[PDB]
Design a protein around this ligand. Structure first.
Ligand SMILES: OC[C@@]12C[C@@H]1[C@H](Oc1cc(F)cc(F)c1)[C@H](O)[C@@H](O)[C@H]2O
Ligand SMILES: [Mg+2]
Length: 534
């Protein structure tokens, strides 16, 4: 069992790579780590104390072509040329969706949690304290654990790192993900919800009158969940105060339940706008910069602040909120813009943003109980494993393909679908993947029948969550046929065979579906598919 030349060339915590047990006593920190052989490769694990800061874990030559992954739901997972990378201009209103360490990204190629090349996966198994990421720094791939200047008096566990090699790159990614699910006690529900969502037909203009119309019609469709999205609430943070023609949040649940659905509701639970009642009552409850409220992002034409999830007052408010929703009968919770809870800044306790983030989502889980389904959105991915049941893994879909939409996080069916493909390996390992809603209506849309089919059947072959978002008056024979045949493709184990493709054509197999072994070949440039079912 000789060492590859490329393995002898690798540095672990600054030392020449080799198997063994080691101690780095450095100026302001100490690390104790082991490098151990595992199936398909190596695992680097151990413990750290002191002020590790931005801690260098691994260094090796950058590959030419890398599969890079953004930390959160909406960001791209895609293959990039590592030598011709150009730093992006970052939208100052959405800085932290692009990166939790934006000094890196504005200079160098950044990949969060994992990175891959043909034949090789480097991936961290968890994000419980540090943010784990990779940067390409002058032709070199460097793995880091970011501790955000927090000091640790006693040892805390490192986030483990695996380095896996095999010529079957999809197999490596699936193995990586099974290791993540074990490290974090992932929730993989045995049942997948079907349902309806308001957002991608009505957007913020949903009325309760239109909601009631769809509630009646939804009885003709195979929907278990009826979820109300952003529209009902008076302000961001004030989740139990309604506007317009909506009744009370409790009354909405009762009407929905009386009509025989599981009620579902959208919140952005770590976000409070500058105008909200909660913020104006509790200016002290938010993350700060130089003592003042730190904008987390701008949306809805307002500055939006982040709740400080290190504060017990804030965690009690979250518990009471989600406990109050549970009492009302909600059992499906779409929790959005979660990245806000993990923004860098000043908190009451000197803990990391990731430690803060995890206390918040853990509180939500406790409050809604084991019988509620949590769907994460706009969220850091690895820190949420073990807490959420489903997770949005792409940018928003849209009632158009997005011919003039670039690959930059704006809504477009084409880029939403691409992420459902490139992150496919998380599915049934981290959680249920949510590829975002099907849009099957045949008026008030620019999608063709073929584009609807392509999106929906790819989602079914991937075994992903299937939720529809339409004015159900506008969905006729074709849309009902697409939904029916989609649900027939569920239940398998998918693999994207050519995960390193750069031309947006993918071959996808899934074994053991409700239609047997299936194969779809999809081309996201030509907008064509070819589906075979055994
Ligand atoms: O405000 C409601 C809403 C749009 C927000 C969220 O989609 C966004 C995704 C973004 F990158 C930015 C943004 F402002 C919104 C989410 O992903 C959607 O499904 C839906 O719930
Ligand atoms: Mg499954």
């Amino acid at each position: 069992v000789p060492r590859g030349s490329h393995m002898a060339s690798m540095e672990i915590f600054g030392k020449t790579f080799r198997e063994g047990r080691f101690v780095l006593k450095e100026k302001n920190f100490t690390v104790e780590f082991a490098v151990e052989k595992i199936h398909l490769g190596w695992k680097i694990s151990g413990r750290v104390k002191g002020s590790p800061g931005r801690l260098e874990v691994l260094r090796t030559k950058a590959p030419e072509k890398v599969l890079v992954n953004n930390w959160q739901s909406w960001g791209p997972c895609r293959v990039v040329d590592a030598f011709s990378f150009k730093p992006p201009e970052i939208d100052p209103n959405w800085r932290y969706t692009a990166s939790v360490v934006p000094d890196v990204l504005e200079r160098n190629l950044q990949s969060d949690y994992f990175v891959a090349e043909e034949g090789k996966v480097y991936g961290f198994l968890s994000s419980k304290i540090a943010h784990p990421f990779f940067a390409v720094e002058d032709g070199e791939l460097v793995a880091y654990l970011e501790y955000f200047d927090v000091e640790f008096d006693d040892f805390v566990p490192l986030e483990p790192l695996v380095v896996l090699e095999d010529p079957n790159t999809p197999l490596l990614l699936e193995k990586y993900a099974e290791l993540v699910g074990m490290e974090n006690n992932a929730r993989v529900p045995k049942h997948t919800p079907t349902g309806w969502c308001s957002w991608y037909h009505y957007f913020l203009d949903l009325t309760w009158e239109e909601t009631l119309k769809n509630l009646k019609l939804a009885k003709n469709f195979p929907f278990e969940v009826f979820q109300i999205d952003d529209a009902y609430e008076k302000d961001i943070g004030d989740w139990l105060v309604t506007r317009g023609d909506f009744p009370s949040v409790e009354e909405m649940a009762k009407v929905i339940a009386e009509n025989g659905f599981i009620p579902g509701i959208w919140t952005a639970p770590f976000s409070v706008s500058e105008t909200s009642d909660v913020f104006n009552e509790h200016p002290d409850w938010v993350v700060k910069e130089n003592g003042e409220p730190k904008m987390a992002y701008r949306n809805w034409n307002k500055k939006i602040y982040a709740l400080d999830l290190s504060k017990d007052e804030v965690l009690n408010w979250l518990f009471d909120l989600f406990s109050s929703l549970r009492k009302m009968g909600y059992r499906y919770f779409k929790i959005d813009f979660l990245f806000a809870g993990a923004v860098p800044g000043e908190r009451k306790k000197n803990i990391t943003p990731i430690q803060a983030f995890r206390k918040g989502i853990e509180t939500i889980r406790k409050a809604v109980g084991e019988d509620s389904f949590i769907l994460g959105c706009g969220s850091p991915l690895l820190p949420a494993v073990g807490c959420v049941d489903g997770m949005r893994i792409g940018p928003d879909t849209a009632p158009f393909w997005g011919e003039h939409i670039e690959d930059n996080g704006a809504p477009a069916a084409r880029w939403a679908l691409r992420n459902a493909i490139t992150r496919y390996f998380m599915h049934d390992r981290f959680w249920l993947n949510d590829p975002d809603c099907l849009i099957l209506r045949e008026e008030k849309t620019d999608l063709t029948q073929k584009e609807k089919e392509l999106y929906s059947y790819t989602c079914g072959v991937l075994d992903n969550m299937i939720i529809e978002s339409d004015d159900l008056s506008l969905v006729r024979d074709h849309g009902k046929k697409v939904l029916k045949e989609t649900l027939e493709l569920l239940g398998g184990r998918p693999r994207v065979q050519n995960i390193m493709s750069e031309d947006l054509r993918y071959e996808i197999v899934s074994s053991g579906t409700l239609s047997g072994n299936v194969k779809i070949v999809v081309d996201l440039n030509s907008r064509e598919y070819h589906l075979e079912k055994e």
